[PDB]
Amino acid sequence: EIDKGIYQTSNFRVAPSKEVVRFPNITNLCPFGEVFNATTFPSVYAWERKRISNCVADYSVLYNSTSFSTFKCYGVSATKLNDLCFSNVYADSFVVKG
Amino acid sequence: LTPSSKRFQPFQQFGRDVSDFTDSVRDPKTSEILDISPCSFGGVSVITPGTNTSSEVAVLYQDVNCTDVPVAIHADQLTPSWRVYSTGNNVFQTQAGCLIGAEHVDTSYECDIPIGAGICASYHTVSSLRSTSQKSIVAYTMSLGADSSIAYSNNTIAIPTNFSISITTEVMPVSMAKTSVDCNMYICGDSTECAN
Amino acid sequence: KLQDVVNQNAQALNTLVKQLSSNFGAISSVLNDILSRLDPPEAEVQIDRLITGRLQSLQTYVTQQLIRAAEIRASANLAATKMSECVLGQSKRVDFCGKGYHLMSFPQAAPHGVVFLHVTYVPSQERNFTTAPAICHEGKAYFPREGVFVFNGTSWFITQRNFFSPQIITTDNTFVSGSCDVVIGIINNTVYDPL
Amino acid sequence: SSIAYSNNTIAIPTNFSISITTEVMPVSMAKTSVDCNMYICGDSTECANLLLQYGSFCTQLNRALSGIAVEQDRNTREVFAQVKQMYKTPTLKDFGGFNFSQILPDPLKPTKRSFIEDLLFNKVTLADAGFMKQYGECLGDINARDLICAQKFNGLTVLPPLLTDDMIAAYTAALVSGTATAGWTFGAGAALQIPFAMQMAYRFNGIGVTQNVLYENQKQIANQFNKAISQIQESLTTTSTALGKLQDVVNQNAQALNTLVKQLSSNFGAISSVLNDILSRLDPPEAEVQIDRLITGRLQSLQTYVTQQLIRAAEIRASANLAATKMSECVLGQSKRVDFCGKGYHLMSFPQAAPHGVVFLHVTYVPSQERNFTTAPAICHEGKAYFPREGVFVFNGTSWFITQRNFFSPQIITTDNTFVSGSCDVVIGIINNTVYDPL
Ligand SMILES: *[C@@H]1O[C@H](CO)[C@@H](O[C@@H]2O[C@H](CO)[C@@H](O[C@@H]3O[C@H](CO)[C@@H](O)[C@H](O)[C@@H]3O)[C@H](O)[C@H]2NC(C)=O)[C@H](O)[C@H]1NC(C)=O
Ligand SMILES: *[C@@H]1O[C@H](CO)[C@@H](O[C@@H]2O[C@H](CO)[C@@H](O)[C@H](O)[C@H]2NC(C)=O)[C@H](O)[C@H]1NC(C)=O
Ligand SMILES: *[C@@H]1O[C@H](CO)[C@@H](O[C@@H]2O[C@H](CO)[C@@H](O)[C@H](O)[C@H]2NC(C)=O)[C@H](O)[C@H]1NC(C)=O
Ligand SMILES: *[C@@H]1O[C@H](CO)[C@@H](O[C@@H]2O[C@H](CO)[C@@H](O)[C@H](O)[C@H]2NC(C)=O)[C@H](O)[C@H]1NC(C)=O
Ligand SMILES: *[C@@H]1O[C@H](CO)[C@@H](O[C@@H]2O[C@H](CO)[C@@H](O)[C@H](O)[C@H]2NC(C)=O)[C@H](O)[C@H]1NC(C)=O
Ligand SMILES: *[C@@H]1O[C@H](CO)[C@@H](O[C@@H]2O[C@H](CO)[C@@H](O)[C@H](O)[C@H]2NC(C)=O)[C@H](O)[C@H]1NC(C)=O
Ligand SMILES: *[C@@H]1O[C@H](CO)[C@@H](O[C@@H]2O[C@H](CO)[C@@H](O)[C@H](O)[C@H]2NC(C)=O)[C@H](O)[C@H]1NC(C)=O
Ligand SMILES: *[C@@H]1O[C@H](CO)[C@@H](O[C@@H]2O[C@H](CO)[C@@H](O)[C@H](O)[C@H]2NC(C)=O)[C@H](O)[C@H]1NC(C)=O
Ligand SMILES: *[C@@H]1O[C@H](CO)[C@@H](O[C@@H]2O[C@H](CO)[C@@H](O)[C@H](O)[C@H]2NC(C)=O)[C@H](O)[C@H]1NC(C)=O
Ligand SMILES: *[C@@H]1O[C@H](CO)[C@@H](O[C@@H]2O[C@H](CO)[C@@H](O)[C@H](O)[C@H]2NC(C)=O)[C@H](O)[C@H]1NC(C)=O
Ligand SMILES: *[C@@H]1O[C@H](CO)[C@@H](O[C@@H]2O[C@H](CO)[C@@H](O)[C@H](O)[C@H]2NC(C)=O)[C@H](O)[C@H]1NC(C)=O
Ligand SMILES: *[C@@H]1O[C@H](CO)[C@@H](O[C@@H]2O[C@H](CO)[C@@H](O)[C@H](O)[C@H]2NC(C)=O)[C@H](O)[C@H]1NC(C)=O
Ligand SMILES: *[C@@H]1O[C@H](CO)[C@@H](O[C@@H]2O[C@H](CO)[C@@H](O)[C@H](O)[C@H]2NC(C)=O)[C@H](O)[C@H]1NC(C)=O
Ligand SMILES: *[C@@H]1O[C@H](CO)[C@@H](O)[C@H](O)[C@H]1NC(C)=O
Numbered sequence A: 001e002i003d004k005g006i007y008q009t010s011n012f013r014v015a016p017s018k019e020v021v022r023f024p025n026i027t028n029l030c031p032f033g034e035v036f037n038a039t040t041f042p043s044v045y046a047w048e049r050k051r052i053s054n055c056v057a058d059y060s061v062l063y064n065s066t067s068f069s070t071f072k073c074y075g076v077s078a079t080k081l082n083d084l085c086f087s088n089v090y091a092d093s094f095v096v097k098g
Numbered sequence B: 001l002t003p004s005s006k007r008f009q010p011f012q013q014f015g016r017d018v019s020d021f022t023d024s025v026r027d028p029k030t031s032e033i034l035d036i037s038p039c040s041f042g043g044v045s046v047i048t049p050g051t052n053t054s055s056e057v058a059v060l061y062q063d064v065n066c067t068d069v070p071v072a073i074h075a076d077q078l079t080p081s082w083r084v085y086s087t088g089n090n091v092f093q094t095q096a097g098c099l100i101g102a103e104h105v106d107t108s109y110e111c112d113i114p115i116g117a118g119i120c121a122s123y124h125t126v127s128s129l130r131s132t133s134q135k136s137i138v139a140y141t142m143s144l145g146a147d148s149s150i151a152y153s154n155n156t157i158a159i160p161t162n163f164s165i166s167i168t169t170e171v172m173p174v175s176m177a178k179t180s181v182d183c184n185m186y187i188c189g190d191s192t193e194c195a196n
Numbered sequence C: 001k002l003q004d005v006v007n008q009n010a011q012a013l014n015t016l017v018k019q020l021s022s023n024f025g026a027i028s029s030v031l032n033d034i035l036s037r038l039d040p041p042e043a044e045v046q047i048d049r050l051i052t053g054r055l056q057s058l059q060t061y062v063t064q065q066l067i068r069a070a071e072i073r074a075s076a077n078l079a080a081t082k083m084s085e086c087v088l089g090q091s092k093r094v095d096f097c098g099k100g101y102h103l104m105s106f107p108q109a110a111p112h113g114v115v116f117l118h119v120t121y122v123p124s125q126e127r128n129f130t131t132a133p134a135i136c137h138e139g140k141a142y143f144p145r146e147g148v149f150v151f152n153g154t155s156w157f158i159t160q161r162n163f164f165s166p167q168i169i170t171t172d173n174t175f176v177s178g179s180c181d182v183v184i185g186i187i188n189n190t191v192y193d194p195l
Numbered sequence D: 001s002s003i004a005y006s007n008n009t010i011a012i013p014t015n016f017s018i019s020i021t022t023e024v025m026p027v028s029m030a031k032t033s034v035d036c037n038m039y040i041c042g043d044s045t046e047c048a049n050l051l052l053q054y055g056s057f058c059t060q061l062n063r064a065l066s067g068i069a070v071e072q073d074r075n076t077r078e079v080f081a082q083v084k085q086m087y088k089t090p091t092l093k094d095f096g097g098f099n100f101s102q103i104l105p106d107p108l109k110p111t112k113r114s115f116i117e118d119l120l121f122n123k124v125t126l127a128d129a130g131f132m133k134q135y136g137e138c139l140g141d142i143n144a145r146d147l148i149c150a151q152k153f154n155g156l157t158v159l160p161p162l163l164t165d166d167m168i169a170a171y172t173a174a175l176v177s178g179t180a181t182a183g184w185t186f187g188a189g190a191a192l193q194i195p196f197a198m199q200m201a202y203r204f205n206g207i208g209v210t211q212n213v214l215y216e217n218q219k220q221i222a223n224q225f226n227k228a229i230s231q232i233q234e235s236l237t238t239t240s241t242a243l244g245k246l247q248d249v250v251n252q253n254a255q256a257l258n259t260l261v262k263q264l265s266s267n268f269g270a271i272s273s274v275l276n277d278i279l280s281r282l283d284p285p286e287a288e289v290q291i292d293r294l295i296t297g298r299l300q301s302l303q304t305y306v307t308q309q310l311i312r313a314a315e316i317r318a319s320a321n322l323a324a325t326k327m328s329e330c331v332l333g334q335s336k337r338v339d340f341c342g343k344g345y346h347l348m349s350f351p352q353a354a355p356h357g358v359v360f361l362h363v364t365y366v367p368s369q370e371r372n373f374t375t376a377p378a379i380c381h382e383g384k385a386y387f388p389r390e391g392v393f394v395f396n397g398t399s400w401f402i403t404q405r406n407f408f409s410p411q412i413i414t415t416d417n418t419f420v421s422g423s424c425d426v427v428i429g430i431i432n433n434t435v436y437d438p439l
Helices: A033-038 A078-083 B080-086 C001-021 C030-036 C039-087 D047-055 D057-080 D115-123 D147-153 D164-181 D196-207 D210-215 D218-237 D244-265 D273-282 D284-332
Strands: A006-008 A046-052 A087-091 B015-018 B022-026 B033-035 B044-048 B058-059 B091-094 B097-100 B113-117 B117-122 B140-141 B146-148 B155-175 C101-110 C113-132 C135-137 C140-144 C149-152 C156-159 C176-178 D009-025 D031-034 D085-087 D154-158 D345-353 D357-375 D379-381 D384-388 D391-393 D400-403 D420-421
Touching: A006 B113, A006 D164, A078 D273, A087 D379, B080 D154, B117 B155, B155 C001, B155 C039, B155 C149, C001 C039, C030 C039, C039 C101, C039 C113, C039 D057, C039 D284, C140 D210, C156 D345, C176 D210, C176 D391, D009 D218, D009 D244, D009 D284, D031 D284, D047 D273, D047 D284, D115 D164, D115 D218, D115 D345, D115 D379, D147 D154, D154 D244, D154 D357, D164 D284, D164 D345, D196 D210, D196 D345, D210 D218, D218 D357, D244 D284, D244 D357, D273 D284, D284 D357
Parallel strands: B146 D085
Antiparallel strands: A006 B044, A046 A087, B015 B022, B022 B033, B044 B058, B058 B097, B091 B097, B113 B117, B117 B140, B155 C113, C101 C113, C113 C149, C135 C140, C140 C176, C149 C156, D009 D357, D031 D154, D345 D357, D357 D391, D379 D384, D384 D420, D391 D400
């Protein structure tokens, strides 16, 4: 029930119904097989940094081959990784005891 | 999303203004710069004579011309009943904005509902009175006061020959309700742990 | 106005009550729910969230109350001034008590307020006349004291401004100053001398 | 300053000046509205749902701001719409030699305001022109972006006043015309017509000077009035800070709105000040943690803005109540309160519209060119003491006279001039002199 007068109203009339997604066109997927499945890995003290660029990061390719006892992401959510684009990524590799 | 004239640095992907609103983006596929604008342009005000009285309303759009309202409010995405208020025959332009859904009359009345910039609205009977019982929202220019003629002359005065005793009434607040709050009851009222 | 004051206070108090149902980022708005579900540490996290929210809402209420009390105090100071100047006296201030010339005033109690009945004098039924600034009698200019020279159809009279009461022009009614030349619009007429 | 107190010596002015001073009073401020949902979580549905959980605060904030806006319109109506009849601007603007041309609107000018009002509206810089922006004016280049577009994109808007500047100018024109033609009478009851010279004589009586002082010196008084108005116009036309208070109100409101906008860039302990960043990076639970932090911060800043606005509106309301009292007491009447209208003895007053305010031109009578005389409390004639009525005894060089206090006009001491009370012994300083008997 409204008394007579003029009232400012918040927007309920129009809501989005379409999604427009615009990613760079990158064909090749990131070389997970080379980084994760390599014959040798460095020591902890001599740890090696590699830069990854110009690729699509699709972790599903690992599902039938790699276990990943530990997978912990800090700045971001793991469920968000498929929807994100990164300006730069580095990969540090080494071996430690459990 | 609209095309933009914003000039971007060679490698910057988006632009933001002082409030950190994302003003513009660069499309990765084509490298063009697009402006991003809020879904709701600005404030809209609904004018009603009272749900008791009627279900008719008028809409006032504050910043827009009457030509630009269907684009401003995205009429193509609204319901048809909203599109009725996007464009029509009863469209009026005020300094307050564009007012749609109110009949404009050239008679000036005392202000009833203030639209602004000298324009008021009311619920008079339609001037045509074809149905003879219909009443519409009517938009008019507010009347400031009664027109009066006073004739200035030298060597002529006006002197009252009579008087009236007038008693007027003046209502003044002097007090309000004295209220007390037991904040312990308001927050953590019966909980000892919360009280600690 | 009195009803507006009542409504504002009641509405503010109702809003204060309704804010308790409002969650502030806690899991629940009911304190007992988070108390019965959660162990003391995370419970203290949620309860601190609720405490901060409710303390903020209460502070909002009290600030608005201070501002409203300031408005009411200004109104009550004006009301006391009017009781002093309109009820216990006759006010020469224009429109301070009534619209017309203030005559007297009476107070009446009202819920949380006072209603002043202002009795005023309103002149009415005006008549046009021709006037003169002064009257040149013999060689001397005559100016009215407490009046205006007015031309009735037959002869010149002097009257008070607010009420038309024509009087004969005597030496007691008007005083003498200067000469006839300086005044603009002076007219020739006799001034009655009682002696 | 040195003032020499003595018994039996008085100072009496032999001359006077017509003084016109100006008083600037704010009567209103900018009516602002906030779309809370646009300000916090403006385009995000998820954030909006969280905001719904947070509370009914937005309803209360909007209620406060709308109350302020309605109060602004009430302020303007109380100050200016104090006359029920809109008296027409007289064709001839010269009454008894007094020039009302600069006060009244000019038929030839396209603007309906008067000349002085034109100067006043030029003086204030902004006058809310920048705040209003049409559709499509905000899209553009990086240099084209300004703070008003940032305010628009975030839900903060400025509402136009109900009374147009032309309507306010019409009100002030009606007031000035009613004063020129009707006098003080239109303020209470019906409007009686009076020649301007006779109304001026009535004002002079109200001050305490007799009517003949006005009528004999009419040309000088008219010239002083016209010169004072010319000086007002000249002071206004050159750059000055006479209208600094109106500009201060404008600047306070603009700065408050700008601070409100800037607070959106401020982080409140969240990972980012941009809601979309944390939405696109974090999964909904920790996203809700960060978003609740941002919601609390922005809601708090909005509440701060609204509280400061309530306090400022209270100040403006007190100012507008004072302006309405002055319009009633100085414009529709002659005020006997000291320094309420003008510095001197208040004679009359005129209203002029100014951006969000009123300017009062107070015409006052200022005594000058005083002369020292010797005085007596009373005069002992035969056995009886004589006291002046409406006068003071002064010893001119030759003989004793009686004069009015504010203007030196010596008169013969007759039995009509003075009354008799008591005997000569009681009075201290009584002097022997003859009292003329007309019979
Ligand atoms: C009452 O005020 C009005 C103002 O509207 C006076 O009328 C204006 O008087 C001035 C002065 O003569 C005129 O402007 C200037 O005149 C001089 C010549 O002295 C000339 O050199 C300038 O170029 C300019 O023309 C003006 O035309 C005239 N009218 C208006 C509408 O401004 C009036 O004189 C004053 N006194 C009265 C009416 O007794
Ligand atoms: C890691 O890489 C090695 C080397 O490519 C893989 O070993 C090969 O396994 C395939 C079976 O899929 C054989 O046909 C090749 O002969 C093997 N090559 C060598 C050099 O051993 C190994 O399977 C890879 N492991 C994973 C989990 O991908
Ligand atoms: C990414 O895709 C866009 C298409 O959206 C490519 O742009 C096209 O480029 C070709 C060759 O220059 C043109 O013929 C098309 O007209 C372009 N289309 C548009 C929409 O601009 C772009 O080249 C692609 N980038 C990469 C690296 O493959
Ligand atoms: C006194 O008489 C004068 C006329 O001599 C009246 O003035 C006229 O008033 C009417 C009223 O509508 C106007 O239409 C005319 O234009 C006026 N003409 C002139 C020459 O003044 C005046 O109104 C009378 N006053 C009263 C109180 O009756
Ligand atoms: C004002 O003028 C009128 C004439 O218009 C004077 O008329 C009086 O009229 C009555 C009855 O007609 C006579 O009995 C009086 O003797 C007249 N007065 C005279 C002749 O002086 C009236 O007196 C004048 N004065 C007023 C009204 O105060
Ligand atoms: C009152 O105003 C009238 C109207 O302007 C004045 O009458 C004019 O006076 C001049 C000067 O003698 C004459 O040239 C005109 O012919 C007169 N006009 C009319 C219609 O009579 C009158 O002088 C003024 N009275 C006073 C006392 O100033
Ligand atoms: C009032 O009466 C005096 C005296 O009768 C008038 O003054 C005379 O005016 C005429 C015409 O201007 C002259 O010829 C005489 O010489 C004047 N006499 C004196 C003594 O000055 C005066 O004009 C009358 N006033 C009015 C308004 O008619
Ligand atoms: C809305 O309509 C107004 C006219 O009422 C337009 O203002 C005009 O704009 C043109 C183009 O810049 C100018 O040449 C005119 O001087 C303007 N007139 C006025 C009175 O300001 C305004 O541009 C329109 N807005 C839109 C978005 O179309
Ligand atoms: C009161 O003071 C005024 C202002 O000085 C005097 O008016 C001047 O008078 C002289 C002649 O005495 C003129 O030349 C000037 O033009 C006048 N000035 C103005 C501004 O009008 C006036 O004479 C003095 N009167 C008395 C009685 O002392
Ligand atoms: C009137 O005369 C007296 C002198 O009898 C003036 O008083 C003197 O004023 C001067 C002014 O600076 C002082 O320096 C003297 O000390 C005063 N002496 C005495 C005895 O009063 C007085 O100022 C004169 N008033 C006016 C208005 O001129
Ligand atoms: C005040 O005293 C003076 C003397 O100081 C009186 O002087 C008058 O002077 C003029 C010209 O000198 C004479 O024509 C007058 O006759 C004188 N008045 C007389 C002798 O009474 C003056 O009159 C006195 N009264 C005032 C100024 O009102
Ligand atoms: C005004 O003050 C003067 C100065 O004090 C008084 O003159 C003195 O009066 C007393 C009492 O008669 C004498 O003893 C002194 O010698 C006087 N001094 C001078 C300098 O004359 C005078 O009496 C006072 N006047 C009044 C009316 O009180
Ligand atoms: C005013 O005159 C009276 C009467 O002449 C004076 O009173 C006389 O004063 C002298 C001296 O004190 C006495 O000798 C007389 O006896 C008094 N006569 C009477 C009837 O009282 C009085 O002093 C004079 N006033 C002044 C100020 O000089
Ligand atoms: C409002 O509703 C009441 C019913 O409760 C009705 O009596 C009244 O006429 C209505 N007011 C109108 C139609 O203006």
